[PDB]
C-alpha cells in the first residue's frame, strides 16, 4: 500500500523524503501525459506501468493493497505468504525503489508545470 | 472506492487517461472554491455533492467503500447485493462516469492555477 | 483516517472548506521542504510530525487508520476503545484540528508554488 511504497522508498532512498518524490516530472505521482523528463521520472512510468500489470488481478488495488516485505540494512525482500496481487504489488514497489536510488534527483524536475511539459 | 471510480471512467471513457480528469477545473479532484469552469467540471461537482450526501450513513467514506459494479460493453451497472453506502457511492460514480463521457474536454482546463480561477 | 481528519476540521472549523487546508503552504498536504509560510502552516508541520511518531507502530498507517471519536457542539473527544495506532493517529489529528481553529487563514498561501517558497 502508499504507506509501504513510501517505507521502501525511505529504505533505500534514506536522504531524501518522499515529499521530493510524490510530484516530479510527468509521472512521480502520475501516469499518462507526456515524455518521461529525465531518468528518474522513467523510474515512475515503469512502476506506472507494473501498477497497471497488477490491477489486471481481480479487486488488485495497489495503493490500498497490503503486502508483507523486509528492509533490512538498505535491502528490499518481498515475502513469500504474498497473495498474488500482494506479490505484484510489493515486487512493483521494491523495483522503482531501487530504481529511484539510482537515478539522479533533478531540482528543475520537482513541482513541474504538467501543461508546460508533460502533453 | 477510488481505483473503482476509476475504471468507471475508463469503462464509458475509454480513450482518455485518469490522470486527464484527476486535475481538472475547480472540481475535478476538488471540491468547493469556485464557480464550474465548463460543463465536465459541472459534472464533477455534482459528484462531489453526491459523495457529501453518500457521507450522511455513518462510516460512510466513498473513495475507500468498496462496492459491487459491472463494467460491460461501456454500459456500468451497480450491483444489487450493495450496502446502503457501497450502493449511493456506486450511483454517484456511475452519474459522474456517464456524465464524463458527454462532457467535451477543454485541455485549457487542465492543471489550472485555482487561485486564478477558482476563488 | 483521512476522512475523520476532514471532519475534525469541519468540527473545529465549519466555515472553511476541507479544500481550503489540503494544498496550503508547504506543509498542510505535505511535509517535508521548507520553512513553514505562517502559523496555520506550522499547525500542519507538527500534524506530519505527530504522524511520523504514529508510525513507528508497527502497520499504523495514519491516513488509511480508521479510530472511534466523537465532535460534540464543536468539541473533539478520542474514545477510549482506540487501539495504540487508533489512539495516537486520533490525538494527532484532535490537536491539528484545534490548531487550525485559532491560526488564522492566509489566503496568499493557498496552493502556492512549492519551488518559490518551500526550499
Ligand atoms: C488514483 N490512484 C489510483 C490512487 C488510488 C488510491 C490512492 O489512495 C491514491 C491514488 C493516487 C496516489 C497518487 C500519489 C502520488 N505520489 C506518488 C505521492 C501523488 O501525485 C500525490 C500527490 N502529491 O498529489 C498523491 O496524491 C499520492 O501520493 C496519493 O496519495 C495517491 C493516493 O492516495
Ligand atoms: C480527501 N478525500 C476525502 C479523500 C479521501 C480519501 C482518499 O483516499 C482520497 C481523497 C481525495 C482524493 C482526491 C483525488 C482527486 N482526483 C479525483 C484524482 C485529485 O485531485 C487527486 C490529485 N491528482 O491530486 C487525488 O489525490 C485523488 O485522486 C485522490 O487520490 C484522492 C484520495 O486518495
Ligand atoms: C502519502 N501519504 C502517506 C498518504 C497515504 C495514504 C493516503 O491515502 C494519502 C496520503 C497523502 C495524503 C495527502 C493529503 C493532502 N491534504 C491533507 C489534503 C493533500 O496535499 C492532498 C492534495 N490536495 O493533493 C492529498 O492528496 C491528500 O488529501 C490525500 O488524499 C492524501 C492521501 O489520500
Ligand atoms: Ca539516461
Ligand atoms: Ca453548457
Ligand atoms: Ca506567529
Redesign the interface.
Same mark, same amino acid.
Given at each position: 500500500? *502508499? #504507506?509501504q511504497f513510501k517505507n521502501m522508498i525511505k529504505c533505500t532512498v534514506p536522504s531524501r +523524503? &518522499? &515529499? @521530493?518524490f510524490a @510530484?516530479y516530472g510527468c509521472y512521480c505521482g502520475?501516469?499518462? +501525459?507526456g515524455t518521461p523528463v529525465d531518468d528518474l521520472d522513467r523510474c515512475c512510468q515503469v512502476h506506472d506501468n507494473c501498477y497497471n500489470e497488477a490491477?489486471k488481478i481481480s479487486k488488485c &488495488?495497489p !495503493? !490500498?493493497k497490503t503486502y508483507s516485505y523486509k528492509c533490512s540494512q538498505g535491502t528490499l525482500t518481498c515475502k513469500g505468504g504474498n497473495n498474488a496481487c500482494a506479490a505484484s504489488v510489493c515486487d512493483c514497489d521494491r523495483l522503482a525503489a531501487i530504481c529511484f536510488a539510482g537515478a539522479p534527483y533533478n531540482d528543475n524536475n #520537482?513541482?513541474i @508545470? *504538467?501543461?508546460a511539459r508533460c502533453q
Open positions: 500500500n *502508499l #504507506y +523524503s &518522499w &515529499w @521530493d @510530484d502520475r501516469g499518462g +501525459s490491477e &488495488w !495503493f !490500498f #520537482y513541482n @508545470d *504538467l501543461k
